[PDB]
Design a protein around this ligand. Structure first.
Ligand SMILES: [Mg+2]
Ligand SMILES: [Mg+2]
Ligand SMILES: [Mg+2]
Ligand SMILES: [Mg+2]
Ligand SMILES: [Mg+2]
Ligand SMILES: [Mg+2]
Ligand SMILES: [Mg+2]
Ligand SMILES: [Mg+2]
Ligand SMILES: [Mg+2]
Ligand SMILES: [Mg+2]
Ligand SMILES: [Mg+2]
Ligand SMILES: [Mg+2]
Ligand SMILES: [Mg+2]
Ligand SMILES: [Mg+2]
Ligand SMILES: [Mg+2]
Ligand SMILES: [Mg+2]
Ligand SMILES: [Mg+2]
Ligand SMILES: [Mg+2]
Ligand SMILES: [Mg+2]
Ligand SMILES: [Mg+2]
Ligand SMILES: [Mg+2]
Ligand SMILES: [Mg+2]
Ligand SMILES: [Mg+2]
Ligand SMILES: [Mg+2]
Ligand SMILES: [Mg+2]
Ligand SMILES: [Mg+2]
Ligand SMILES: [Mg+2]
Ligand SMILES: [Mg+2]
Ligand SMILES: [Mg+2]
Ligand SMILES: [Mg+2]
Ligand SMILES: [Mg+2]
Ligand SMILES: [Mg+2]
Ligand SMILES: [Mg+2]
Ligand SMILES: [Mg+2]
Ligand SMILES: [Mg+2]
Ligand SMILES: [Mg+2]
Ligand SMILES: [Mg+2]
Ligand SMILES: [Mg+2]
Ligand SMILES: [Mg+2]
Ligand SMILES: [Mg+2]
Ligand SMILES: [Mg+2]
Ligand SMILES: [Mg+2]
Ligand SMILES: [Mg+2]
Ligand SMILES: [Mg+2]
Ligand SMILES: [Mg+2]
Ligand SMILES: [Mg+2]
Ligand SMILES: [Mg+2]
Ligand SMILES: [Mg+2]
Ligand SMILES: [Mg+2]
Ligand SMILES: [Mg+2]
Ligand SMILES: [Mg+2]
Ligand SMILES: [Mg+2]
Ligand SMILES: [Mg+2]
Lengths: 61, 60, 185, 172, 58, 159
RNA sequence: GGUUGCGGCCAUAUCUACCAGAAAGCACCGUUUCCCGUCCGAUCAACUGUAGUUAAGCUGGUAAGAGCCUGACCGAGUAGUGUAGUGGGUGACCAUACGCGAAACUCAGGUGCUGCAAUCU
RNA sequence: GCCCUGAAAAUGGAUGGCGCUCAAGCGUGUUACCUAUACUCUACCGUCAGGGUUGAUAUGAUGCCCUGACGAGUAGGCAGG
RNA sequence: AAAUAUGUAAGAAGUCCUUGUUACUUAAUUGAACGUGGACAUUUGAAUGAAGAGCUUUUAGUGGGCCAUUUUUGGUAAGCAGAACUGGCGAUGCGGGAUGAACCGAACGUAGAGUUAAGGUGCCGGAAUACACGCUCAUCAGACACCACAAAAGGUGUUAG
RNA sequence: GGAAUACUGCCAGCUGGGACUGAGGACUGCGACGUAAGUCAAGGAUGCUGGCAUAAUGGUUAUAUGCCGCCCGUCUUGAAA
């Protein structure tokens, strides 16, 4: 917070650290899904509608 | 919890330990007519950023 | 629904008792599952399992096969377990002493062994002397020595065996079996 | 795209050792939340400078609350939009209390008349017509006369119950 | 009468039931089609390098 | 009738590079190949002999054999529902050392070196490749950089 | 740094025109008994390094030079395109969302680098 | 943009029907509300998996007991009855 | 000269040092292959997942297909013929599209309570004759993807530009 | 110049109404509050009161009422045809 108010005070802009964490909920059901995303869906354990997991953000994820 | 929110060293093994969360459907509703457009286009699907909380909390 | 990644309700493709019905074997099992459960000792877990095997996966262990496994360094005084039936082999002469725990012994096999001042225990006897299966040497027989398995793979250039009912020239030794009669195999 | 908020979006190219400290660029953006704002900032930037977001970052995002949000204003609005057969530029005026107010009727008005959904419309400039009689579009000049007063003929009180034991009057 | 002629439809579904795997892998792999003289000499470099090790046990 | 000769559909695959026809440079003949080398297969249609069948164009594999003028290469190839093992007799003119393996060896040499200079300090290493991460917080300044503010552009035909 | 022999990458090296080139080298060049090849000692072969010459080859320099190379927030985040929608539109076709992204064009810089061995004011 | 002309077929008829005109029509936006065999929690059946347990101790050891997950089906395969 | 697709690699079957074998190869104990002996295990060499991995034998049915988005060939076209990837129908009920193989939503043991999807909420019919800004008057209005069609061309109707 | 408020988010802040469920059957576990003895909302409901006798209730059946339900068998890409 204060980092933001300082930067403002010094005529600058504290641009925040990119989020390292996201939560993913799957909202589409299980029929008619294309093979590629379907695979990725399972490798994040989202294999059933409204189920959700955490994901660490890197380029690879 | 800490090991998650901070990511950090054994996040992997911490998070994997965690069985996928079984949320309900959103009590309150999805807040949009059709869900299978993007959040930017009028609702659901894609990164809705720090809006995910209001969503999850109603599915929780 | 569930995007299943795994076949649901699949059964461990593993025998779980003997299919057999020899009450004495079921008794032998009832013994070694007790041992297997109430101890560590890998040996019992292994014997337990191996009592479930079908007659094909219990090929016979020979008396020469035992003798030769006993010329192993530091093994001359171990007690050879053969969850199966030990047979006789006229082809070794000098045969050592030792005590052998098997399921069955052929006539000549408990001769040979005994005559050499050796012993022929049973696995439930063995159980007592060696609760945790100590000083034991487990020996299985040659499975692939079977005659059935000769014909497994039968294809061009696999060099396996034909299922033929009677052999000779005039029986599948011509076209396809040589360069001079079309092609070879 | 709905109840509108106005945003300042300040962004830049990602720094290179060769170009540390690249130039900063700003837009005023009307969107309902900030995600759509940020997304709009790129949409436009991509069309002006040679940049996509994978090669840039957004520095700041701040809401621009109307300065005098209870003073009635005459607005100039310039617009670029897509019809079914061409694309066009277009000036129109809107009398309202805030920019955020104005833009919303702008966005509705474009749908009503030229059937233009939000996607097909670029908001060029928006501005408070300082000196009245710089207003040109009559349908606002009409409201600028001295001692403007008018009635609302044919009142239609909505009813609470389905039967009525009297024949209604429309008299305001 | 005329009938459909060809299609690969459904064929990768079929191939991917219990399929693809990888290729099976071994140290000391097949020596099929390797230069016969070299094999011949390898034969001898092995017998020798064997020998010499049993000589180192007495 | 249909036509499925050996070099079919290879009009552009076996063409030479624009302004690179003629004699194949000597470098090609001076590279040395041992077994276990990982080679890239890319036909040269001027050297007609020892040619890879068009399948293997663009495919990498390992040398299983070395001969007077050619390497033998092992390729894994999917037919049906399974990879099969494939042995190719390719003249060297159609073959190349795979740079990606050289990235690897060089990295292995790096990682033994890093590991030393840490035991020579008894400190920790951290040797696995990490993937490209988020971004940490920054403070960009406005000194000499008051944000130029832009707006969308009018329509205008130029034709 | 020159030069030569053997090279590597094979135009930043090639093309056109004009000059310039110490020293060494290379070259042109002199000769035809001999091995040798020609319609022709021109090529090829041998001989002298002696009679000559930098004219040429070769090396560099010039040129709003042709070509070729390099760059660029030059055009263009355009064209094309993977994914999305019970999006627009009679349709032809098009806009938007998350992504990838050129060619030509324009301008700017450049015009061989280099290994081994030998040799030179 | 909407509306009008351009706009002709055979039983009597179809925005699903009624009917609707500041709509109950067209464009757009805001909320609330209705509802699948889907999602969340729980009982029960079964199937599959993991575990405990006849140690001297009445009545099933192919048993008793604890735990998790899963359940569409032609042609066809096997199993328990 | 893309995009999408596509090959390979990311280590113990590894890395390093020492020096053994041979009839191959080198001018050459030079190489080449395969070894002895010694050293190196915290992240041992990216991510994420793993409901276990590996493996054998044997046999049923089937061997007319069809549909949708996209790519695409023949044809004026076709609810026509014919290929590409994928997802479907076939084999599959359930909720929505009145209706309907194939669209949308979602796949199914027997049930209770909750919440939703796609689609709806004047009345038939469960659910605001809700809120908000415009637009439109048709003596042939119009009313929702697949979808049950409409075009060139015109209008001093009316709206905004 | 000093405030308020909106919007958004947080509280291991305090509370009212309504609905469905009550599996298990000695004890063993993790806690909570207590100075303590003890108490508890802590590994699944108990307590208090009342109703029922040719009856309260439950099963079957017939009929009516709301919604829903085409003829099976078969060959077929496709059958109520
Ligand atoms: Mg809920
Ligand atoms: Mg509420
Ligand atoms: Mg509700
Ligand atoms: Mg909204
Ligand atoms: Mg041995
Ligand atoms: Mg065998
Ligand atoms: Mg035999
Ligand atoms: Mg009155
Ligand atoms: Mg026929
Ligand atoms: Mg046909
Ligand atoms: Mg056929
Ligand atoms: Mg045919
Ligand atoms: Mg052809
Ligand atoms: Mg082609
Ligand atoms: Mg040439
Ligand atoms: Mg040839
Ligand atoms: Mg001559
Ligand atoms: Mg001459
Ligand atoms: Mg000469
Ligand atoms: Mg010359
Ligand atoms: Mg030039
Ligand atoms: Mg879809
Ligand atoms: Mg469309
Ligand atoms: Mg249409
Ligand atoms: Mg396009
Ligand atoms: Mg007619
Ligand atoms: Mg009629
Ligand atoms: Mg329409
Ligand atoms: Mg409306
Ligand atoms: Mg609307
Ligand atoms: Mg149910
Ligand atoms: Mg079933
Ligand atoms: Mg792949
Ligand atoms: Mg992993
Ligand atoms: Mg079969
Ligand atoms: Mg078959
Ligand atoms: Mg068949
Ligand atoms: Mg379906
Ligand atoms: Mg059929
Ligand atoms: Mg279905
Ligand atoms: Mg319909
Ligand atoms: Mg009706
Ligand atoms: Mg109603
Ligand atoms: Mg009304
Ligand atoms: Mg449409
Ligand atoms: Mg008009
Ligand atoms: Mg109870
Ligand atoms: Mg009674
Ligand atoms: Mg009845
Ligand atoms: Mg009915
Ligand atoms: Mg009826
Ligand atoms: Mg038919
Ligand atoms: Mg039928």
């Amino acid at each position: 917070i204060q980092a933001k108010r300082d930067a403002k005070a010094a005529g600058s802009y504290y641009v925040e650290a990119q989020h390292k964490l996201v939560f993913v909920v799957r909202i589409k059901g299980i029929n008619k899904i294309p093979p590629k995303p379907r695979k990725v869906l399972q490798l994040l354990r989202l294999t059933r509608i409204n189920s959700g997991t955490f994901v660490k953000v890197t380029k690879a994820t | 919890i800490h090991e998650i929110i901070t990511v950090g060293p054994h996040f992997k093994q911490a998070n994997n330990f965690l069985w996928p969360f079984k949320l309900s459907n959103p009590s309150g509703g999805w807040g949009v007519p059709r869900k299978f457009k993007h959040f930017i286009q009028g609702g659901s699907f894609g990164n809705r950023e720090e809006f995910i909380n209001k969503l999850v909390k109603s599915m929780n | 629904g569930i995007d299943h990644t795994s076949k649901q309700h699949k059964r461990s493709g593993h025998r779980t008792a003997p299919k057999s019905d020899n009450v004495y074997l079921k008794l032998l099992v009832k013994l070694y599952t007790f041992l297997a459960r109430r101890t560590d000792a890998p040996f019992n877990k292994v014997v337990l399992k191996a009592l479930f095997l079908s007659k094909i996966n219990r090929p016979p262990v020979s008396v020469s096969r035992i003798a030769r496994a006993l010329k192993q360094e530091g093994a001359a005084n171990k007690t050879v377990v053969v969850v199966g039936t030990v047979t006789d082999d006229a082809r070794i002469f000098e045969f050592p002493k030792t005590t052998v725990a098997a399921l069955r012994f052929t006539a000549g096999a408990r001769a040979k062994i005994v005559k050499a001042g050796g012993e022929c225990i049973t696995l439930d006897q063995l159980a007592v002397r060696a609760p945790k299966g100590q000083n034991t040497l487990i020996l299985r027989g040659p499975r692939n020595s079977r005659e059935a398995v000769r014909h497994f793979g039968m294809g061009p250039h696999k060099g396996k065996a034909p299922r033929i009912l009677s052999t000779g020239r005039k029986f599948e030794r011509a076209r396809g079996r040589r360069r001079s009669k079309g092609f070879k195999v | 795209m709905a109840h509108f908020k106005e945003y300042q979006v300040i962004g830049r190219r990602l720094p290179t050792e060769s170009v540390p400290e690249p130039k900063l660029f700003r837009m005023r953006i009307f969107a309902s939340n900030e995600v759509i704002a940020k997304s709009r900032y790129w949409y436009f930037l991509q069309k002006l400078h040679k940049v996509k977001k994978a090669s840039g970052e957004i520095v700041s995002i701040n809401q621009i609350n109307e300065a005098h949000p209870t003073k009635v204003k005459n607005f100039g609005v310039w617009v670029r939009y897509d019809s079914r057969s061409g694309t066009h530029n277009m000036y129109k005026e809107i009398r309202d209390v805030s920019r955020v107010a104005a833009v919303e009727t702008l966005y509705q008005d474009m749908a009503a008349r030229h059937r233009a959904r939000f996607r097909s419309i670029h908001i060029l400039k928006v501005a408070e017509i300082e000196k009245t009689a710089d207003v040109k579009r009559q349908y606002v000049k009409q409201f600028l006369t001295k001692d403007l007063k008018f009635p609302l003929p044919h009142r239609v009180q909505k009813s609470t119950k389905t039967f009525s034991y009297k024949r209604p009057s429309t008299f305001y | 009468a005329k009938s459909k002629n060809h299609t690969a439809h459904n064929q990768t579904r079929k191939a991917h039931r219990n399929g693809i795997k990888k290729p099976k892998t071994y140290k000391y792999p097949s020596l099929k089609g390797v230069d016969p003289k070299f094999r011949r000499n390898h034969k001898h470099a092995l017998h020798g390098t064997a020998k010499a090790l049993a000589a180192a046990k007495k | 009738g249909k036509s499925h000769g050996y070099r079919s559909r290879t009009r552009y695959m076996f063409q030479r590079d624009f302004r690179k026809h003629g004699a194949v440079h000597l470098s090609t003949y001076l590279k040395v190949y041992k077994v276990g080398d990982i080679v890239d297969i890319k036909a040269n249609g001027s050297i007609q002999k020892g040619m890879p069948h068009k399948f293997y164009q663009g495919k990498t594999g390992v040398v299983y054999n070395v001969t007077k003028s050619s390497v033998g290469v092992i390729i894994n190839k999917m037919v049906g529902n399974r990879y099969l093992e494939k042995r190719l007799n390719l003249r060297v003119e159609h073959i190349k050392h795979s740079k990606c393996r050289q990235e690897f060896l060089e990295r292995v040499k790096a990682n033994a070196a890093k590991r030393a200079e840490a035991k020579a300090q008894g400190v920790a290493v951290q040797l696995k490749r990490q993937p490209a991460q988020p971004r940490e917080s920054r403070i960009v300044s406005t000194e000499g950089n008051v944000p130029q503010t832009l707006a969308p552009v009018p329509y205008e035909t130029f034709i």
